[PDB]
Amino acid sequence: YEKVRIYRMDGSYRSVELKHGNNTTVQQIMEGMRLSQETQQYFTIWICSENLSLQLKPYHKPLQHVRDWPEILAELTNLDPQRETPQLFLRRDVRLPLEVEKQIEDPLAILILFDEARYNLLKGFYTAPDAKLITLASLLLQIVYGNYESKKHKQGFLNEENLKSIVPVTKLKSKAPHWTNRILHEYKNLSTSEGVSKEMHHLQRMFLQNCWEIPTYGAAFFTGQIFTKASPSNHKVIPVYVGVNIKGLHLLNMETKALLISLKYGCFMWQLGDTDTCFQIHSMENKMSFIVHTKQAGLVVKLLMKLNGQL
Amino acid sequence: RRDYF
Amino acid sequence: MREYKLVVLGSGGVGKSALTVQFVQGIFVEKYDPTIEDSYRKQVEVDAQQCMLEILDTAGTEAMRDLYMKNGQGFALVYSITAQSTFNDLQDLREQILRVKDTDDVPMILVGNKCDLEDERVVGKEQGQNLARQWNNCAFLESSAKSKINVNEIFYDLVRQINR
Numbered sequence: 001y002e003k004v005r006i007y008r009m010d011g012s013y014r015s016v017e018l019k020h021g022n023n024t025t026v027q028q029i030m031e032g033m034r035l036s037q038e039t040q041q042y043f044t045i046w047i048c049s050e051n052l053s054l055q056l057k058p059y060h061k062p063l064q065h066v067r068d069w070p071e072i073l074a075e076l077t078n079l080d081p082q083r084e085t086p087q088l089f090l091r092r093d094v095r096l097p098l099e100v101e102k103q104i105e106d107p108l109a110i111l112i113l114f115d116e117a118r119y120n121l122l123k124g125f126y127t128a129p130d131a132k133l134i135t136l137a138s139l140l141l142q143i144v145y146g147n148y149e150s151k152k153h154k155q156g157f158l159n160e161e162n163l164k165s166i167v168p169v170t171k172l173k174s175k176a177p178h179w180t181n182r183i184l185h186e187y188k189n190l191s192t193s194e195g196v197s198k199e200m201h202h203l204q205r206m207f208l209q210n211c212w213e214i215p216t217y218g219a220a221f222f223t224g225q226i227f228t229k230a231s232p233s234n235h236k237v238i239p240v241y242v243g244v245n246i247k248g249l250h251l252l253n254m255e256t257k258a259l260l261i262s263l264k265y266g267c268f269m270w271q272l273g274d275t276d277t278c279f280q281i282h283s284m285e286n287k288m289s290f291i292v293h294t295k296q297a298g299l300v301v302k303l304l305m306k307l308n309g310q311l
Numbered sequence: 312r313r314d315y316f
Numbered sequence: 317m318r319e320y321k322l323v324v325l326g327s328g329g330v331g332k333s334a335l336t337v338q339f340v341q342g343i344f345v346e347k348y349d350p351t352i353e354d355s356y357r358k359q360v361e362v363d364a365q366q367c368m369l370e371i372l373d374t375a376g377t378e379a380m381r382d383l384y385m386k387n388g389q390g391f392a393l394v395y396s397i398t399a400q401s402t403f404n405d406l407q408d409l410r411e412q413i414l415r416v417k418d419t420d421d422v423p424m425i426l427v428g429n430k431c432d433l434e435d436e437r438v439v440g441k442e443q444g445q446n447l448a449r450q451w452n453n454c455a456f457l458e459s460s461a462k463s464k465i466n467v468n469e470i471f472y473d474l475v476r477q478i479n480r
């Protein structure tokens with residue numbers, strides 16, 4: 001048998017036998033994973049390198065997309081292939097309704113979703129006010145470090161290295177150092193409060209509860225660029241991440257991850273450009289508009305249609 | 312071939 | 317944070333996966349499900365410091381054993397107290413590890429799993445202690461993935477061995 005590693009975002013993997021070599025499909029790979037129907041429903045196989053992540057179709061043959069990654073990169077992006085090695089991942093299905101996710105109780109499905117949500121938080125893809133980031137930090141301390149204890153946790157504990165595993169990298173330098181006391185206090189409170197279940201899946205679910213209300217939760221992210229309407233040129237190039245999820249469309253400044261706009265389905269409309277290299281958003285209810293340039297335009301528009309359509 | 316999501 | 321590469325070895329059916337999954341995820345896998353090659357990651361606290369564990373959960377039979385041993389820093393050698401054959405298989409693994417590492421001085425622990433299954437016991441504790449004695453006084457525990465007895469200690473103890 002040939003085998004392939006299917007990774008998760010924590011860096012773990014499960015090797016799966018390919019019964020039809022490179023003609024094995026995603027559905028067959030999923031069947032060969034260790035998973036009940038219960039755990040499986042929420043997740044599918046994605047192909048991802050450092051700067052390009054794509055959710056596969058169940059009839060796709062993933063080893064062929066790995067094989068063709070260079071053509072795919074050049075069709076969808078301007079990245080240097082030499083810097084992008086793809087792997088296959090088990091990840092949240094981008095079409096998973098938030099209403100369906102909210103009633104999950106399976107502990108394995110909960111930890112897989114938790115790991116993915118943690119990964120996005122630490123990379124900076126979740127925008128939230130400091131109080132919410134502090135609450136998520138305190139939950140990670142309970143999950144990862146167990147019960148609070150003054151001798152260990154009060155002083156010299158929340159240094160750089162440690163803060164790095166609990167706050168977004170975008171807040172580590174500037175903002176994070178000052179949160180240390182409120183994080184600790186909240187952590188203390190989680191431990192000291194016996195009303196709060198300390199079963200692992202319960203705490204992980206609590207972290208997820210606090211992510212579900214973040215507007216980019218569950219987003220597939222794409223890269224693009226907008227041009228400012230201020231002027232000089234006509235005008236300045238702003239690289240952006242475009243987040244698409246079951247809630248709507250979200251633009252992030254590529255460099256700082258700052259949230260530029262968030263638009264809910266029903267409050268905007270889109271049109272694909274003639275060459276498939278851009279799309280336009282019209283925020284009716286605000287009567288503003290903007291154009292994102294990206295070779296992933298077609299993909300972004302088809303996803304907006306699907307996720308708007310299911311809502 | 313090229314239809315994702 | 318120090319990374320620690322740990323390897324779980326032993327024959328078919330002993331609970332390599334069940335122990336690993338209990339330690340890492342806190343879940344008990346109740347179902348026959350043979351492994352090809354799984355790798356898990358877990359941050360833990362050992363002897364009051366933070367350790368990042370990478371744990372390789374291996375197939376019960378072989379061709380990449382030699383590479384696992386080459387790469388691994390610490391080894392959990394697991395048999396089932398319920399099955400003598402699984403116990404007998406361990407001698408060779410031990411010797412194989414010593415060959416690849418070209419030394420006797422290798423973090424290792426002998427684990428007799430399924431100790432919740434007292435009435436199915438075919439391997440006595442004595443035979444287990446005895447074998448560990450013989451292996452240059454190797455660390456030794458009985459564990460249950462199902463009841464959680466001695467599950468963390470298997471992995472913490474390899475970390476302290478590696479830290480020697």
Ligand SMILES: Nc1nc2c(ncn2[C@@H]2O[C@H](COP(=O)(O)OP(=O)(O)NP(=O)(O)O)[C@@H](O)[C@H]2O)c(=O)[nH]1
Pocket residue numbers: 326327328329330331332333334335345346347348349350351352374375376377429430431432433459460461462463
């Ligand atoms: N009662 C009991 N059953 C156990 C224990 N550990 C594992 N089992 C059961 O024994 C069977 C084998 O467990 P598993 O962990 O898959 O064994 P393994 O060593 O990984 N097998 P493989 O080498 O094929 O990958 C499973 O049904 C499992 O639930 C235990 O401590 N107690």
Ligand SMILES: [Mg+2]
Pocket residue numbers: 332333334349350351373374
């Ligand atoms: Mg196994």
